[PDB]
Amino acid sequence: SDTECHFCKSVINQAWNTSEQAMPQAMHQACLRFWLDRQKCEQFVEQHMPQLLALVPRSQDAHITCQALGVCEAPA
Amino acid sequence: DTECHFCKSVINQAWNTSEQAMPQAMHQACLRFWLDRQKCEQFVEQHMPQLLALVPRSQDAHITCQALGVCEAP
Numbered sequence: 001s002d003t004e005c006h007f008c009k010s011v012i013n014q015a016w017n018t019s020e021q022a023m024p025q026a027m028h029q030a031c032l033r034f035w036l037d038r039q040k041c042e043q044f045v046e047q048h049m050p051q052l053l054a055l056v057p058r059s060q061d062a063h064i065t066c067q068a069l070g071v072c073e074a075p076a
Numbered sequence: 077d078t079e080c081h082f083c084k085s086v087i088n089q090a091w092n093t094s095e096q097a098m099p100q101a102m103h104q105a106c107l108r109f110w111l112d113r114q115k116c117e118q119f120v121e122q123h124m125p126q127l128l129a130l131v132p133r134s135q136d137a138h139i140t141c142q143a144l145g146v147c148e149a150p
């Protein structure tokens with residue numbers, strides 16, 4: 001049903017949404033402890049966080065996964 | 077619990093490329109920014125557990141399928 005599709009889309013990638021919030025801090029923590037340059041680490045994270053964000057599944061990916069699960073029958 | 081395993085298999089497969097690409101993206105980003113091939117490998121391989129610990133795992137797929145109604149609590 002459509003209700004079941006909405007619910008699947010709401011929770012399927014929840015683990016990624018949780019983690020995405022902490023990626024900038026974690027990247028900064030890793031960088032600073034290794035490269036020890038706060039200024040350069042701030043630049044690294046700002047310039048390259050977008051690459052990780054692009055790996056986080058989006059709502060369209062949730063739809064397609066939930067279709068694979070058989071719950072989203074709609075195309076979108 | 078075949079439906080549970082089906083659900084987890086699907087989620088784990090949907091996540092796999094992002095899971096495997098996360099450390100590679102950091103490695104590629106490091107090479108493009110800090111340049112040093114030697115120190116970039118060390119950085120990624122042993123010095124960013126804070127970031128790699130954030131990558132979802134099978135246990136998270138299980139809990140997701142629990143939320144969906146097809147898996148029991150682990």
Ligand SMILES: [Zn+2]
Pocket residue numbers: 077081
């Ligand atoms: Zn089983």
